[PDB]
Amino acid sequence: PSWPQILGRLTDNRDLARGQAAWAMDQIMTGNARPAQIAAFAVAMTMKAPTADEVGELAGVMLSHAHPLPADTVPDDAVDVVGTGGDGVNTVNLSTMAAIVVAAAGVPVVKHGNRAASSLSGGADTLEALGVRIDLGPDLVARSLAEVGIGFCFAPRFHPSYRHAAAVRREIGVPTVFNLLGPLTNPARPRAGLIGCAFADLAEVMAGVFAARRSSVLVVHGDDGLDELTTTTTSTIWRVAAGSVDKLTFDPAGFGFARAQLDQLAGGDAQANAAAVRAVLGGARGPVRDAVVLNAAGAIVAHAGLEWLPAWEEGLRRASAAIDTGAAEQLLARWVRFGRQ
Amino acid sequence: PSWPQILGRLTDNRDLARGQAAWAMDQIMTGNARPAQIAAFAVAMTMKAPTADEVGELAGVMLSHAHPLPADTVPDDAVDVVGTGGDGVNTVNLSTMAAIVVAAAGVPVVKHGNRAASSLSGGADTLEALGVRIDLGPDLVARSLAEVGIGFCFAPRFHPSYRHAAAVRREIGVPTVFNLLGPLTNPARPRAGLIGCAFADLAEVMAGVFAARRSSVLVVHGDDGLDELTTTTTSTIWRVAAGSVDKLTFDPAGFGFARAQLDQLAGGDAQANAAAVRAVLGGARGPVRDAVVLNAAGAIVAHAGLEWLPAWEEGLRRASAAIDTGAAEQLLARWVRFGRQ
Ligand SMILES: O=P(O)(O)OC[C@H]1O[C@H](OP(=O)(O)OP(=O)(O)O)[C@H](O)[C@@H]1O
Ligand SMILES: O=P(O)(O)OC[C@H]1O[C@H](OP(=O)(O)OP(=O)(O)O)[C@H](O)[C@@H]1O
Ligand SMILES: CSc1cccc(C)c1Nc1cc(C)ccc1C(=O)O
Ligand SMILES: CSc1cccc(C)c1Nc1cc(C)ccc1C(=O)O
Ligand SMILES: [Mg+2]
Ligand SMILES: [Mg+2]
Ligand SMILES: [Mg+2]
Ligand SMILES: [Mg+2]
Secondary structure (H helix, E strand, C coil), X not given: CCHHHHHHHHHCCCCCCCCHHHHHHHHHXXXXXXHHXXXXXXXXXXXXXXXXXXXXXXXXXXXXXXXXXXXXXXXCCCEEXXXXXXCCCCECCHHHHHHHHHHHCCCCEEEEECCCCCXXXXXXXXXXXXXXXXXXXXXXXXXXXXXXXXXXXXXXXXXXXXXXXXXXXXXXXXXXXXXXXXXXXXXXXXXXXXXXXXXXCCHHXXXXXXXXXXXXXXXXXXXXXXXXXXXXXXXXXXXXXCCEEEEXXXXXXXXXXXXXXXXXXXXXXXXXXXXXXXXXXCCCCCHHHHHHHHHHHHHHHHHHCCCHHHHHHHHHHHXXXXXXXXXXXXXXXXXXXXXXX | CCHHHHHHXXXXXXXXXXXXXXXXXXXXXXXXXXXXXXXXXXXXXXXXXXXXHHHHHHXXXXXXXXXCCCXXXXXXXXXXXXXXXXXXXXXXXXXXXHHHHHHHCCCCEEEEECCCCCCCCCHHHHHHHCCCCCCCCHHHHHHHHHHHCEEEXXXXXXXXXHHHHHHHHHHHCCCCHHHHHHHHCXXXXXXXXXXXXXXXXXXXXXXXXXXXXXXXXXXXXXXXXXXXXXXXCCEEEEEEECCEEEEEEECHXXXXXXXXXXXXXXXXXXXXXXXXXXXXXXXXXXXXXXXXHHHHHHHHHHHHXXXXXXXXXXXXXXXXXXXXXXXXXXXXXXXXXXXXX
């Protein structure tokens, strides 16, 4: 195998042979790839139209190189709540707020996260601002999960060999297939999740990767462009269960949610988004809460997939009570306290 | 303009706006583009399918940055004989031998040329092996042209600012839109040429660039994959004249040429290819001679373009006579002697 062989095949608009995508990604992760080669591969893989098999090979190499958590430290029903980012809408941190609520409802959460790429404050940035430690290693994340009910895996910390690739990506700016890999490479390997995809035409491929792993996942894309379940309009959901994918459209109005305007979900810097978290967890009613409760419920539905309508109802009930009882506010405080010890 | 904008447009499989290819190439030539960006552009432009407008902009930037020849030193009817290479056959240097014959027939030839990419020898390398000085500045190429009847512009010598692009070309290996630019960027700007193209789907694009310039050119592709008029099988000729492009098929056997086997046109190292030049110019008959006579005749038809079958007949006569009189052998000896001075 070689770069001229693989790049040539891609520029011929042909799918790769089995193992070729993995070879390429392994060359990239081990530092044996030139930036020009990394870039050529990223762009070519994107314009050919990647397959689930191919993207799965990429994610697989990353996970084969990632720092794992210790054995028997991640509950079999742990869930992730994370998105690709890149929706260019710059919102409050919906996945992170949902994650907290979900944990507070008693679903174990091992969250994969990262700083912002284009937004003002990403999940990792806002958690930082809240006083939550984002620098924890495998053992401490494992302890966080057991002691608090939530663990945060900071992507750069668990995927050190990915730096070469990430660098090239910033240099070229355009989204590529690599923009899918974040959600697909949680190092704790949870089997369930609510997974945001900003790219409507690649979400199905992402779902395909999760199906192959037999995860219970909702891959979500808001029809307004959000890599979240949105409240401003309908969302597209690729529901992954029993190794199968099926495309659905979801309308929150069916569950009594009023439509919101995108500006109502708008975020700011880390201090502002941190304030927004506290407000929701503090019981503030409004569009931000509604969006949080919806995405939380979605994660719980994914967890249950390990009955659609009853599952959503139960999820909305549980997510709302987790906030109203103070359990979610208390969990964030305990999470902060955990790191300070 | 910006890289995320331009690259985003290409990955969305859209043609660029007027001026965007030029901005990109200008960033590349002025050392303002990172290797990753260069590569991403080359690959993205290739897989979108470049237009004649876009490739003409690339070539135009290169020519706007090139060392020119002194004013009033390039005959208005000068011709080029050159191809893309990248045919992966390692043949004898047909364009270079053809170029000598054409000059010997009294048609001024300013040849754009370069060392080999994958071939064992290459045009510029074979000339060196023959004692010809390839690394001459603008002033001396002009003198060579006036005194000998032929001039060689060494692409690296006249296009220094292309160095960044050439490096990335090497690293990624795969042919890209950049592989079209050599024949399109002769710094002497001849208005006629026999132009070889190894990429059948891109030959029409090259033809359109010459058409926009109102050049008189035959863009040629051997149906055996040769970036020359072949003697193995038929050939596809995009004829360019009066700003219009007419595609047509060409069979050498219609002029008495026996079909040869590509083994017979095979090449070797510089010393080997240099020997083959001396052999053809010395009167040796066989498949190599025939191919040289055919391509030389093609260049002469292109020159005439500044009647199809009659032009080819006169072209074939003039080519054969230029060898048979010894004029081509003599012109090479004088070309060598010119360099030793
Ligand atoms: O800058 P962007 O490209 O727009 O990405 C915004 C954030 O969204 C993603 O994470 P995540 O879903 O976990 O964070 P969230 O809570 O804000 O939704 C990503 O890792 C970023 O942190
Ligand atoms: O290494 P390759 O990619 O296979 O290309 C072989 C040669 O052909 C091209 O020029 P040119 O047509 O002028 O040289 P020629 O005499 O061999 O035809 C190219 O510049 C190379 O020198
Ligand atoms: C230096 S960024 C990085 C570092 C290590 C691993 C990964 C996977 C990423 N990238 C992401 C991680 C997540 C969790 C979300 C998005 C991305 C991305 O860059 O698209
Ligand atoms: C470092 S190679 C180079 C250097 C300067 C200018 C050019 C245009 C090229 N490239 C070519 C020039 C010719 C004449 C033929 C082919 C190529 C090519 O790169 O494929
Ligand atoms: Mg998110
Ligand atoms: Mg988001
Ligand atoms: Mg040639
Ligand atoms: Mg050739």
